[PDB]
Design a protein around this ligand. Sequence first.
Ligand SMILES: [K+]
Ligand SMILES: [K+]
Ligand SMILES: [K+]
Ligand SMILES: [K+]
Ligand SMILES: [K+]
Ligand SMILES: [K+]
Ligand SMILES: [K+]
Ligand SMILES: [K+]
Ligand SMILES: [K+]
Ligand SMILES: [K+]
Ligand SMILES: [K+]
Ligand SMILES: [Mg+2]
Ligand SMILES: [Mg+2]
Ligand SMILES: [Mg+2]
Ligand SMILES: [Mg+2]
Ligand SMILES: [Mg+2]
Ligand SMILES: [Mg+2]
Ligand SMILES: [Mg+2]
Ligand SMILES: [Mg+2]
Ligand SMILES: [Mg+2]
Ligand SMILES: [Mg+2]
Ligand SMILES: [Mg+2]
Ligand SMILES: [Mg+2]
Ligand SMILES: [Mg+2]
Ligand SMILES: [Mg+2]
Ligand SMILES: [Mg+2]
Ligand SMILES: [Mg+2]
Ligand SMILES: [Mg+2]
Ligand SMILES: [Mg+2]
Ligand SMILES: [Mg+2]
Ligand SMILES: [Mg+2]
Ligand SMILES: [Mg+2]
Ligand SMILES: [Mg+2]
Ligand SMILES: [Mg+2]
Ligand SMILES: [Mg+2]
Ligand SMILES: [Mg+2]
Ligand SMILES: [Mg+2]
Ligand SMILES: [Mg+2]
Ligand SMILES: [Mg+2]
Ligand SMILES: [Mg+2]
Ligand code: NA
Ligand code: NA
Ligand code: NA
Ligand code: NA
Ligand code: NA
Ligand code: NA
Ligand code: NA
Ligand code: NA
Ligand code: NA
Ligand code: NA
Lengths: 57, 30, 93
Amino acid sequence: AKLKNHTSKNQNRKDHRNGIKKPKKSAYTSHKGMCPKYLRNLRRSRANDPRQSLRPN
Amino acid sequence: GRNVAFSNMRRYKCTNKGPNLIKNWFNQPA
Amino acid sequence: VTYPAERRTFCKREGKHTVHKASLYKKGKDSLLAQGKRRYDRKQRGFGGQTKPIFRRKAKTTKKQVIRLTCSSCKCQTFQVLKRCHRLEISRL
RNA sequence: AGUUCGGCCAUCCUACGGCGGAAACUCCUUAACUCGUUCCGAAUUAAGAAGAGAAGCGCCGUCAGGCCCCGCCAGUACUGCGAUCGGAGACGUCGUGGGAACACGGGGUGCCGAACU
RNA sequence: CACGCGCCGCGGCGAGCCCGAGGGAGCCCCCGCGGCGGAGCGAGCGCGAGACGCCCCGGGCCCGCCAUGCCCCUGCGGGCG
RNA sequence: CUGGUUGCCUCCGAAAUGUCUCCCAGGACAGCCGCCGCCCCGCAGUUGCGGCCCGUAGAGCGCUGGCCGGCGGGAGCGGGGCCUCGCCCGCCCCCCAAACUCCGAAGGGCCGCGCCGCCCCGCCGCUGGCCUGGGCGGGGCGGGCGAAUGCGGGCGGCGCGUGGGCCCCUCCUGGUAAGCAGGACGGGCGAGGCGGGACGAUCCGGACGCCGGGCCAGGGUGCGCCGCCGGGGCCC
RNA sequence: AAACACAGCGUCGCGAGGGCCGCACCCGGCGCUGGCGCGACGUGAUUUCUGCCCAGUGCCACGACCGUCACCGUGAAGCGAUCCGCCGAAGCCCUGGUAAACGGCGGGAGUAACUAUGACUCUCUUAAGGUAGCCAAAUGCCUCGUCGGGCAAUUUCCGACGU
RNA sequence: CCAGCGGGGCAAGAAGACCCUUUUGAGCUUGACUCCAGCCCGGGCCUGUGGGGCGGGGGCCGCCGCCGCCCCGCUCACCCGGUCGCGCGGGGACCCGCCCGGGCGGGGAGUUCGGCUGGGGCGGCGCGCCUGCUACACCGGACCGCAGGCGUCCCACGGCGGGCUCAGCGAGGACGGAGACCUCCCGCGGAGCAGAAGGGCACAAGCCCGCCCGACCCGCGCCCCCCGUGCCGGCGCGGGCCGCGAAAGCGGGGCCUACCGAUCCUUCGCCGCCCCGGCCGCGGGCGCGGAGGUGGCAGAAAAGUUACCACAGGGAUAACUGGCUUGUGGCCGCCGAGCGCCCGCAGCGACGCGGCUUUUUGAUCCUUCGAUGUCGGCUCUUCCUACCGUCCGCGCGCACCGGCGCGGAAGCGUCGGAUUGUUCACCCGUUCAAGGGAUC
Ligand SMILES: [K+]
Ligand SMILES: [K+]
Ligand SMILES: [K+]
Ligand SMILES: [K+]
Ligand SMILES: [K+]
Ligand SMILES: [K+]
Ligand SMILES: [K+]
Ligand SMILES: [K+]
Ligand SMILES: [K+]
Ligand SMILES: [K+]
Ligand SMILES: [K+]
Ligand SMILES: [Mg+2]
Ligand SMILES: [Mg+2]
Ligand SMILES: [Mg+2]
Ligand SMILES: [Mg+2]
Ligand SMILES: [Mg+2]
Ligand SMILES: [Mg+2]
Ligand SMILES: [Mg+2]
Ligand SMILES: [Mg+2]
Ligand SMILES: [Mg+2]
Ligand SMILES: [Mg+2]
Ligand SMILES: [Mg+2]
Ligand SMILES: [Mg+2]
Ligand SMILES: [Mg+2]
Ligand SMILES: [Mg+2]
Ligand SMILES: [Mg+2]
Ligand SMILES: [Mg+2]
Ligand SMILES: [Mg+2]
Ligand SMILES: [Mg+2]
Ligand SMILES: [Mg+2]
Ligand SMILES: [Mg+2]
Ligand SMILES: [Mg+2]
Ligand SMILES: [Mg+2]
Ligand SMILES: [Mg+2]
Ligand SMILES: [Mg+2]
Ligand SMILES: [Mg+2]
Ligand SMILES: [Mg+2]
Ligand SMILES: [Mg+2]
Ligand SMILES: [Mg+2]
Ligand SMILES: [Mg+2]
Ligand code: NA
Ligand code: NA
Ligand code: NA
Ligand code: NA
Ligand code: NA
Ligand code: NA
Ligand code: NA
Ligand code: NA
Ligand code: NA
Ligand code: NA
């Protein structure tokens, strides 16, 4: 008793049913895989800037 | 996808035969 | 495959490179007071026969050989894993 | 015009003839020193200045091979969409869009940039 | 239908909340502990949170676990990074 | 695993696929769908314009292989009678390839189509020979909404059914073939009433509340059976 | 029914403190028995016969204790739990016996005055290479084998033949 | 409406007994796997009272108290026999019993006996991975599709630096030849780079030489397959320590695409923590990382048989009718190399090409497993024509007789026997004896 092995017949219609979802607008600015030396320098420059430092007083 | 916490209740014992393991409280006022 | 008798390698205890001596690692003898052994011995008492599975469908014909390296200045032990091979010789200095 | 260092990597390559050097590059001369060749100062390393355009190099030529551009090949081959269009089929046709290749003919044959003479 | 688990809606109170068993001779009235919540992380000895914000997302800092540099009291202890 | 599972109306509405499974008449996770919401941040199964990618049809024999002959040169070698055909070198020529390609479409895929320009200032524990860079911010000046067409968008929670599919068009593979077996873009039946194709789940039209009137798609207009004539040609 | 039984034939075990069987225990049966007996198996009246193989598996040695193979016991070490040695019953291993135990029982070449065949030779090879007999049999695929008998005519039947 | 009849109602009678599946059974077997009675063997207790031998605590002598094994008495335990206990025996501290230990043990018990699959079985392994094609120019894409490969090999066949250029054509050197070795020339790779195939590579990724061990330690992220989970493999980084090189640089193995493995348990390694009334020493456990393996490769511990048999189901799936197909079987056209004394066609007709049929057998699996009674013969009816005799025409290599070919034509005829269940076949005979269909 053999049954079907494979079909992609209806798959493109199912994909378009609710549109093709775009990624989130925060995935474009993640620090997920950035060079660590660059990230460390960015942190220290912000903290020492009086106009953008969040340190209290 | 079902996401539940697993139950930790034991299966019942001696339901149709054996000692009576059910206690009712209909006699509380009396 | 042939392996050198001596190798200059990183030493964790002293934190630098030093000369090490090569040897072969073998499994030790089974103890009778390990917790798993105690549990197994307790479970096999009495009637009932065998209580745990016994493996019988071997497939591989080799093993992964392990070399033991002994630091010659501090007695720190290290291990290196070779790929699968059929016979291995350590050269003699 | 030359040399050093480069960019793009044949319109710059390959073969065969010819022209040229003041300066430059090159070929050239020597083996104490330095360094060197499975053996060899051939190569390479060091030290020179008697010779030379004979090569390399720059330029010219060839009904040259190659490489590059334009035409023709040809709206042909093939093809997207529509057709109760023809045909037993194999295949073809019409409408509406896109559109080659080989071959052949004509022409061409390095520029650009920074420093010195 | 009973018990257990997840999520949603509604009522009461709210850093709190709660007819437990039981006792007062009042099916419905009065009194009535745990518990859960309030602080986490760590195998464990244990150590232990403030810095920003209508809301949401994200950054930035802080606590625990792991690893390091400098200083010092009561010291394999404390502090700062 | 087989059989059965009891009132009405209204609003929405599938899947027969991917991975794992002592899995193949079953399940879990994902997809498709319903309900419940919450928030306020421009969207698109389309064309146009601009950048980049692919090696299929066709074409061809330069590469890797294969394959008919014709004619010339002979250093060397062989057959045969210093001669005469052969191997070799050159040109010409017939026919080829899912696992050949110097060339190469139609066709597809990805990205872009509003903020810009000038000046000055601050921080860095990164980077540079330096007064170099890069990154992140602040302050002033000028300018402005720069393809078409259509149209509001985004996110979360809980949960069901399904996981035997089949047919048409065009494109393929195995097989002598098959209403055979296995794949691909789009559509349909499943789960789509109505008219036509005499007759059919799928073909040609058209996708549905209950009615009156009008117009007419597809298909037809001797009689059964609603609806026809005129003109040109052929004719067992 | 061609199946079972059967008389006959053969093998095996046991001398009582034994053998075989029952049975939870206590106790039982054969047995009111004693080898001309009891129990366990195979073949199946008479006649005539019953070939070779102990490599395999099985069974048996009042054969042997070689190696291995328990608890117990005993020696050393240790704070003790423990650990390491020695000791070594049966069994297996070893050496033999046994087929009316289970069972098994070969290939290729050459060769005699026509041809044909092959008494004969060579060669590989086994634990042993199917003996006396019998046969297209209730057992032969090819096969409805070939020859003879019987029939007008026979895939049936009978007699022969046999790698 | 009646007497009859047996063509239909796939007539009735039964949740197919054949076949397949289900992580549904049972009977039986054994050299399946896990065991149990029973039996054999050893030690100890039951269990007294005496004697003796041996072996262990250069030569022994041992103390007579230490340790083992062994042997021989006695009777009082214990056991057996005879007797109406009328005028008596036999064994014996062994046996038996009980405890622990070893062996034998289908006599008995429980349980298992994979999957895919043009039905199942036999066979094979697209059951984990890799190259090219199938595949129709992004990506993806099936088959028991095509041609193949993997479960390894290497302390150098690895890292780095330097230097060099390979295969080969042509020409020359000669004991020397179709090839040894030497030299020059030109040489886009036609060589080599561990093993499949496809890519890549020239002052190199190839060959030779020098020095080395980055084939290291700590911690993160991404890509491929993909549910955007795991596993194998790869890549990009932050620190530590190193190798080579003048230096810039490069180096987490063999140029790239394959070469491998969870939980539980065991074993090993560094540094620490716990053993809960305390402290100390052994021992146990715990946090991190390797190794021991599951190839049916996301990973149960597993042999047969049923013709005595089942259970739940299945036309999701075989065996018999029917349907589509026509390779094979059967029938029929076209062509004309030749045969035929000569003479392609009176009669034949090679090499090739085009059709038809469903009276053979295959291929497939659409309908039917809560059943359509499965071969042949006997009996009886009807139908086809692709015509064997008889009818009517024509042709001949047709004198007559007898034959052969073609067209129309389905009315009648197509038989009796021996052997075989046979259809078929084969033989004897005769008025000389076609072929088929209708649920074969
Ligand atoms: K499945
Ligand atoms: K070619
Ligand atoms: K007998
Ligand atoms: K024997
Ligand atoms: K026989
Ligand atoms: K006869
Ligand atoms: K099938
Ligand atoms: K039988
Ligand atoms: K039938
Ligand atoms: K025909
Ligand atoms: K049936
Ligand atoms: Mg499926
Ligand atoms: Mg709707
Ligand atoms: Mg499994
Ligand atoms: Mg082509
Ligand atoms: Mg299903
Ligand atoms: Mg079909
Ligand atoms: Mg349905
Ligand atoms: Mg529809
Ligand atoms: Mg009318
Ligand atoms: Mg004989
Ligand atoms: Mg015979
Ligand atoms: Mg006979
Ligand atoms: Mg007979
Ligand atoms: Mg007869
Ligand atoms: Mg009747
Ligand atoms: Mg009837
Ligand atoms: Mg049934
Ligand atoms: Mg039944
Ligand atoms: Mg199953
Ligand atoms: Mg069973
Ligand atoms: Mg059994
Ligand atoms: Mg199966
Ligand atoms: Mg898989
Ligand atoms: Mg180099
Ligand atoms: Mg580093
Ligand atoms: Mg698996
Ligand atoms: Mg019937
Ligand atoms: Mg019936
Ligand atoms: Mg006719
Ligand atoms: Na137990
Ligand atoms: Na926040
Ligand atoms: Na209709
Ligand atoms: Na007798
Ligand atoms: Na036998
Ligand atoms: Na039974
Ligand atoms: Na891999
Ligand atoms: Na079917
Ligand atoms: Na038929
Ligand atoms: Na029939």
